[PDB]
Amino acid sequence: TTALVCDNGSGLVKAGFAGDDAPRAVFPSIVGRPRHQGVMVGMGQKDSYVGDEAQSKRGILTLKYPIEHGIITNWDDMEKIWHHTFYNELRVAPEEHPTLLTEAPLNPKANREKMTQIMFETFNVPAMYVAIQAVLSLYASGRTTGIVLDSGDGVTHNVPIYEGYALPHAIMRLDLAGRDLTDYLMKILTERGYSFVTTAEREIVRDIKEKLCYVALDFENEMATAASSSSLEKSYELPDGQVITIGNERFRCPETLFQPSFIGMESAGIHETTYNSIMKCDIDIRKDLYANNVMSGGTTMYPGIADRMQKEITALAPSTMKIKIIAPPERKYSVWIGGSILASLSTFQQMWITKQEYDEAGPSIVHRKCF
Amino acid sequence: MVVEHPEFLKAGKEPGLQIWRVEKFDLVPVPTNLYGDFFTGDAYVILKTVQLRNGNLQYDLHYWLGNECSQDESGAAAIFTVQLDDYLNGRAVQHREVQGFESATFLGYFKSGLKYKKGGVASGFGYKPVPDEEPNSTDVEETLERIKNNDPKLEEVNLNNIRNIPIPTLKAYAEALKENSYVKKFSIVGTRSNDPVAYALAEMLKENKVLKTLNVESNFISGAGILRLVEALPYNTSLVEMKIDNQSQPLGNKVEMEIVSMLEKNATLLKFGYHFTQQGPRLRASNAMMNNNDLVRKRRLADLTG
Numbered sequence: 001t002t003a004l005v006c007d008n009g010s011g012l013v014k015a016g017f018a019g020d021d022a023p024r025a026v027f028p029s030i031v032g033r034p035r036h037q038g039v040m041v042g043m044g045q046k047d048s049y050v051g052d053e054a055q056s057k058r059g060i061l062t063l064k065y066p067i068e069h070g071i072i073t074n075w076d077d078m079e080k081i082w083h084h085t086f087y088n089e090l091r092v093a094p095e096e097h098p099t100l101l102t103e104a105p106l107n108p109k110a111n112r113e114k115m116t117q118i119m120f121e122t123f124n125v126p127a128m129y130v131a132i133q134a135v136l137s138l139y140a141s142g143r144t145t146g147i148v149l150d151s152g153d154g155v156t157h158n159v160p161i162y163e164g165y166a167l168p169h170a171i172m173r174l175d176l177a178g179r180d181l182t183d184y185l186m187k188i189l190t191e192r193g194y195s196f197v198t199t200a201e202r203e204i205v206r207d208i209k210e211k212l213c214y215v216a217l218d219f220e221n222e223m224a225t226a227a228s229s230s231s232l233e234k235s236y237e238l239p240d241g242q243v244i245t246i247g248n249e250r251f252r253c254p255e256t257l258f259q260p261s262f263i264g265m266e267s268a269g270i271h272e273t274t275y276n277s278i279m280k281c282d283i284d285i286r287k288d289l290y291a292n293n294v295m296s297g298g299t300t301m302y303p304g305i306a307d308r309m310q311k312e313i314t315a316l317a318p319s320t321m322k323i324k325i326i327a328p329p330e331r332k333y334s335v336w337i338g339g340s341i342l343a344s345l346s347t348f349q350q351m352w353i354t355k356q357e358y359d360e361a362g363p364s365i366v367h368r369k370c371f
Numbered sequence: 372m373v374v375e376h377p378e379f380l381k382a383g384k385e386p387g388l389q390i391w392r393v394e395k396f397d398l399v400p401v402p403t404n405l406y407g408d409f410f411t412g413d414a415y416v417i418l419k420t421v422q423l424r425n426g427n428l429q430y431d432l433h434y435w436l437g438n439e440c441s442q443d444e445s446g447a448a449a450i451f452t453v454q455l456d457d458y459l460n461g462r463a464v465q466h467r468e469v470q471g472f473e474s475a476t477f478l479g480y481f482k483s484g485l486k487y488k489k490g491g492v493a494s495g496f497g498y499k500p501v502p503d504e505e506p507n508s509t510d511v512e513e514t515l516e517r518i519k520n521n522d523p524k525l526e527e528v529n530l531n532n533i534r535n536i537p538i539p540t541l542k543a544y545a546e547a548l549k550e551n552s553y554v555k556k557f558s559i560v561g562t563r564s565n566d567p568v569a570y571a572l573a574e575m576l577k578e579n580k581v582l583k584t585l586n587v588e589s590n591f592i593s594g595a596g597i598l599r600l601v602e603a604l605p606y607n608t609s610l611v612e613m614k615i616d617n618q619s620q621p622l623g624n625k626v627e628m629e630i631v632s633m634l635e636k637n638a639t640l641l642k643f644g645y646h647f648t649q650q651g652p653r654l655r656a657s658n659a660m661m662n663n664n665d666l667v668r669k670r671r672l673a674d675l676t677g
């Protein structure tokens with residue numbers, strides 16, 4: 001029998017089978033419900049739509065995200081995501097498969113229990129396990145020591161990790177990620193005469209962001225170059241399907257990561273949060289951290305970001321520090337891959353919380369076995 | 372936690388050198404006469420055990436990554452290193468060693484110098500548009516008649532997304548359900564129901580002893596209507612699910628508070644479908660449901676003949 005791996009994020013569910021090198025299903029982590037603008041007889045007996053199907057009707061529905069900033073905050077809608085993942089996307093009966101779930105850094109303790117409780121009481125899985133996302137990414141990159149920058153759709157974390165384990169006092173959380181970047185690109189595209197202000201428009205600007213944005217190595221310089229040359233400008237065909245052009249917005253958008261003030265956040269940029277996180281760690285491990293900066297998540301996919309990070313962190317760090325940024329091409333799915341490897345190991349059979357152990361202990365078993 | 376493995380048992384039991392190779396997600400011993408001949412397509416785990424005065428052993432764990440080894444092999448090497456360290460009470464010092472950049476200590480383990488050879492064992496790695504559903508064909512009149520007749524064949528009543536149900540018809544549904552012995556699920560999503568419907572449903576929940584599931588999502592029920600519903604919960608020990616999300620108006624902070632207070636006065640409800648705005652009640656609600664759900668687990672353990 002085969003184990004499942006589900007990596008649940010603010011924007012995307014990544015799910016599949018342990019032993020696979022990549023997730024089999026990736027879809028939006030959303031639940032859509034009708035707007036009160038008359039009875040949608042078209043819905044039939046359904047009370048909501050989930051995932052891709054809810055996305056198709058984003059103009060007809062109000063969409064809710066059961067995970068906010070990496071944390072599950074709507075347990076009923078999260079049950080819907082999980083049911084849809086098992087039964088419609090993977091086509092499995094969850095009570096036949098051990099299931100590995102992921103959690104955010106600094107996940108509150110009650111949440112871990114609740115996740116355990118729902119898997120056993122609602123889905124009757126035979127066994128389960130919860131692993132920290134950033135740690136799985138570090139493992140997928142072949143390392144037990146390093147500092148992960150995990151940036152997705154809802155949240156960015158710096159997670160320093162030593163000899164297998166996160167150092168929670170040094171973890172930092174920045175509520176600034178890909179959805180904010182999508183929203184910001186919508187804005188500055190509107191500055192130059194294009195109308196994009198939600199729904200079929202938010203989703204298309206996301207595509208623009210993914211395909212054309214990049215992180216400038218020197219930002220003030222790139223602005224000047226942009227004015228003159230035009231060698232940077234690129235165009236993009238809408239679905240409707242008119243064709244638009246875009247220039248300095250290509251790198252202004254993800255500049256926000258290094259300059260959160262671009263959207264009115266007081267926070268320091270991710271290069272600074274990486275630094276502060278390293279500096280909260282034991283002196284004797286900082287060299288290892290600096291030399292193993294591992295990028296994770298979809299918002300670390302911008303071309304140029306690793307070099308920019310290398311440059312910014314060099315300027316912050318002692319002059320004599322070896323610094324290295326690791327940016328795997330599959331880092332959109334690093335968390336999931338790490339989970340697939342872990343659940344495949346011959347030593348992992350004894351790590352599952354089994355139905356029987358949960359039945360006897362209750363959900364607080366998760367603090368003792370998933371650690 | 373700490374894990375067993377036949378190779379863990381053998382590890383670090385005495386001074387010397389032990390080498391394992393990652394082979395399809397397992398940790399397999401390297402034949403001692405192949406020590407120092409590393410397949411560049413593979414990943415390995417090396418433990419140096421040095422002996423010191425205490426009688427206690429000193430431990431250094433190196434995981435060696437060949438240039439052509441697959442992601443499952445380097446990830447597993449890393450994880451097995453953490454597991455082995457843990458098994459050894461955390462006393463090992465871990466080292467990442469990559470082909471061409473190995474540390475002097477690790478290179479020093481191999482008397483004749485280590486060698487590389489090509490190859491190794493194989494990796495262990497193995498639309499939609501607008502609602503396309505036929506409408507809810509449920510017959511409102513007929514169904515109401517069946518609930519009144521206490522029809523044994525009727526367990527599930529779904530009036531979701533049905534146009535133009537009079538408010539007195541919905542109120543009648545709630546009145547008939549008072550004495551019905553067979554309906555376990557009732558939902559009226561997106562039927563334009565308002566507070567009168569919710570008030571009647573509240574009275575019903577005080578009397579009905581069979582309904583398990585109630586779904587009133589996506590209607591026009593106010594905080595007062597929602598409050599009245601949950602105020603029925605302590606007079607109910609049969610309903611397990613109440614779904615109320617996506618009413619046309621936010622319920623209001625005061626109401627959210629009165630609601631969680633009622634959720635804490637029922638031990639039966641297992642799911643409450645509502646996204647709380649204030650974090651105080653949001654967590655109180657989550658905990659109340661988790662409390663009630665654990666009661667299920669405990670009576671499932673006690674009914675287990677012991």
Ligand SMILES: Nc1ncnc2c1ncn2[C@@H]1O[C@H](COP(=O)(O)OP(=O)(O)OP(=O)(O)O)[C@@H](O)[C@H]1O
Pocket residue numbers: 008009010011012013069070150151152153154155156177178179206209210211296297298299300301302332
């Ligand atoms: N090629 C790309 N360039 C830039 N951004 C991208 C690219 N591909 C995906 N993204 C962005 O990454 C985000 C999705 O990544 P991911 O799956 O890591 O997030 P998540 O796990 O759902 O969210 P979180 O980790 O914040 O809870 C989206 O905002 C998406 O637009």
Ligand SMILES: [Ca+2]
Pocket residue numbers: 008009010133152297335
């Ligand atoms: Ca994520």
Ligand SMILES: [Ca+2]
Pocket residue numbers: 412413414439440441444490491492493494
């Ligand atoms: Ca190999």
Ligand SMILES: [Ca+2]
Pocket residue numbers: 163456461462463464465
């Ligand atoms: Ca150690």
